[PDB]
Structure 1
Amino acid sequence: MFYGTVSSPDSGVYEMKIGSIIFQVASGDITKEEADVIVNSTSNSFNLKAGVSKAILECAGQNVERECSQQAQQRKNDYIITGGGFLRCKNIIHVIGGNDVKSSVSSVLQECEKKNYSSICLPAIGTGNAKQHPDKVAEAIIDAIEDFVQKGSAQSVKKVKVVIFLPQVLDVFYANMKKREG
Structure 2
Amino acid sequence: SWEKGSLVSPGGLQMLLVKEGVQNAKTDVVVNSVPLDLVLSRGPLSSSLLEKAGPELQEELDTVGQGVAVSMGTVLKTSSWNLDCRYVLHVVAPEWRNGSTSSLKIMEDIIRECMEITESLSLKSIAFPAIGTGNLGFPKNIFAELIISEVFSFSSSNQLSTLQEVHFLLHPSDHENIQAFSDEFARRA
Q: In which range does the TM-score fall when normalised by the shorter chain?
A: 0.7 to 0.9
Unaligned 5+ segments in structure 1 are 1-9
Question: For 1:81-116, what per-residue CA distance to the aligned partner results, in whole angstroms no more than 9, with x for missing partners?
Answer: 101011011100112233632111101100001111
One-letter amino acid of the structure 1 residue matched with residue 57 of structure 2:
V
Match of 2:97 in 1: none
Match of 2:79 in 1: 83
TM-score by length of 2: 0.81
| Runs of 4 or more consecutive aligned structure 1 residues displaced over 4 Å after TM superposition | none
Please identify, of 28-37 and 39-48, the stretch whose mean Cα deviation from structure 2 is larger.
Answer: 39-48
- Larger strand share, 1 or 2: 1
Shift of 1:117: 0.4
Unaligned 5+ segments in structure 2 are 95-102
Q: Is residue 2:171 matched to residue 1:175?
A: no
Matched-pair identity in % = 19
**RMSD, aligned α-carbons:** 1.9
Match of 2:39 in 1: 47
- Structure 1 residues 46, 143: CA separation in 2 closer, same or farther (over 3 Å shift)? farther
TM-score by length of 1: 0.84
Distance 2:128 2:90 in 1: 10
Question: Would you say the 8 A contact 1:81–1:92 is kept in 2?
Answer: yes
Distance 2:154 2:130 in 1: 19
Match runs of 1:90-101 below 5 Å: 90-98=86-94, 100-101=106-107
Question: For 1:62-97, what per-residue CA distance to the aligned partner results, in whole angstroms no more than 9, with x for missing partners?
Answer: 222022122333222411110101101110011223
Number of residue-to-residue matches in the alignment? 171
Q: Is residue 2:25 matched to residue 1:33?
A: yes
Distance 2:36 2:152 in 1: 27
